[PDB]
Ligand SMILES: NC(=O)c1ccc[n+]([C@@H]2O[C@H](COP(=O)([O-])OP(=O)(O)OC[C@H]3O[C@@H](n4cnc5c(N)ncnc54)[C@H](OP(=O)(O)O)[C@@H]3O)[C@@H](O)[C@H]2O)c1
C-alpha cells in the first residue's frame with residue numbers, strides 16, 4: 001500500500017521512510033526542496049528507493065500543497081513541523097499545516113489513518129512536575145506564554161496544533177492517531193546534526209542551554225519510535241494519543257552513564273541546581289505496550305548509536 005511521510009529529509013522522517021520501505025510499503029516522501037542533494041541523496045540511497053520511493057515537493061505554509069502527494073495514499077505520517085515573531089512564523093503555520101494535512105487527507109478520500117508525530121512539549125510544560133505523565137496530560141499554555149522558556153513556541157505550536165487536529169478528527173470521521181516521543185536519540189542517516197542530538201549529547205559538548213530539557217529527561221530510541229509509528233498505523237485497535245518513551249532519568253544519571261562509556265570526553269560530574277534528591281519524571285508508555293508493542297533498545301544503545309554516527313560523520317570530535 002501507499003503511505004505519505006512529511007518531513008522525510010529530517011531525523012525521524014528519513015528513518016521512518018527507511019523502515020516503511022524495508023517493510024515493503026510504497027512511500028511518498030515529501031521535501032520542501034528536492035534539489036537539495038545533501039538531504040535527498042540519503043533518501044534515494046535507501047534500499048528499494050529506486051522502485052518504491054517517490055519524492056514530492058510540499059511546504060506546510062502553502063495551502064493545499066500536500067494534496068497530490070496524499071491522493072491515493074492509504075496512510076499519512078505527518079512528521080514535519082516548522083522550525084522574530086513566533087506567533088505567526090511558527091505557531092499559526094503549525095496549526096494551519098496540521099489542519100492543511102487532514103484537509104488534504106479528506107480531499108484524498110483514500111486515507112484510512114493519519115498518524116501525527118506530536119511532542120513531549122504537548123504533555124509536561126507546566127510549573128509543577130508530576131512524577132509520571134500519561135496521555136491525559138496536556139501542557140499549560142499560559143505558563144508557556146508568560147515564562148517563555150527556550151522552545152516555548154514549539155511547546156505552544158505543537159500543543160495547539162494537536163488539539164486543533166483532534167477537533168477536526170472527531171468531526172470528519174478522520175481516523176487519527178498521535179504519537180508523543182520524548183527526546184529521540186539514536187544513530188541517523190542524515191549528514192547534518194540532528195537537533196535532538198544537539199540536546200542529548202550536551203553533557204559532552206558542554207552546551208548548557210540544552211541541559212534544562214534533560215534535567216529530568218525522558219528518552220526514546222529512534223528505531224523504537226519509527227516502529228511504534230508503523231505499529232500504530234497498522235494495529236487497528238489503536239486509538240487516541242500514545243506516549244512513546246522508554247527511559248527517564250535525571251541529568252546526573254545520564255552524565256554518569258556517559259562518563260563510564262566515554263572517558264574520552266570531558267563529561268562534568270555535577271550540574272547547577274540538581275540534587276541527587278531530584279526526582280525523575282517518567283513518561284508512561286503503558287498504553288502503547290498494553291496494545292502489544294515492545295521496546296527493543298536501551299538508553300545505552302541510543303547514545304552509542306548516536307556518538308558513533310556523530311564521529312563517523314565528523315559531527316563530534318573523537319575525544320576532548
Ligand atoms: N527529535 C526529537 O527529540 C523529537 C521529540 C519529540 C517530537 N519530535 C517531533 O518530531 C518531528 C521530527 O523532528 P526531527 O527531530 O526529525 O526534526 P528535523 O530533523 O529537524 O526534521 C524536521 C523536518 O521538518 C521539515 N520542515 C520544516 N519546515 C517545514 C515546512 N515549513 N514545511 C514542510 N516541512 C518542513 C524539515 O524539512 P526540510 O528542512 O526538508 O524542508 C525536516 O524534514 C517534529 O514534528 C518534532 O516536533 C521530535
Ligand SMILES: O=c1c(O)c(-c2cc(O)c(O)c(O)c2)oc2cc(O)cc(O)c12
Pocket residue numbers: 081118119120121122150151154155158195199209210212213
Ligand atoms: O531546539 C530545540 C527544539 O527544537 C525543541 C522542540 C521541543 C518540542 O516540544 C517540539 O515539539 C519541537 O519540535 C522542538 O526544544 C528545545 C528545548 C530546549 O530546551 C533547547 C532547544 O535547543 C530545543
Ligand SMILES: O=c1c(O)c(-c2cc(O)c(O)c(O)c2)oc2cc(O)cc(O)c12
Pocket residue numbers: 119120121122124125181182183195196197198199213217218219
Ligand atoms: O520535539 C522535542 C521534544 O518534544 C523535546 C522534549 C523532550 C522531553 O523529554 C520533554 O519532557 C519535553 O517536554 C520536550 O525535546 C526536544 C529537544 C530538541 O533538541 C528537539 C526537539 O524536536 C525536541
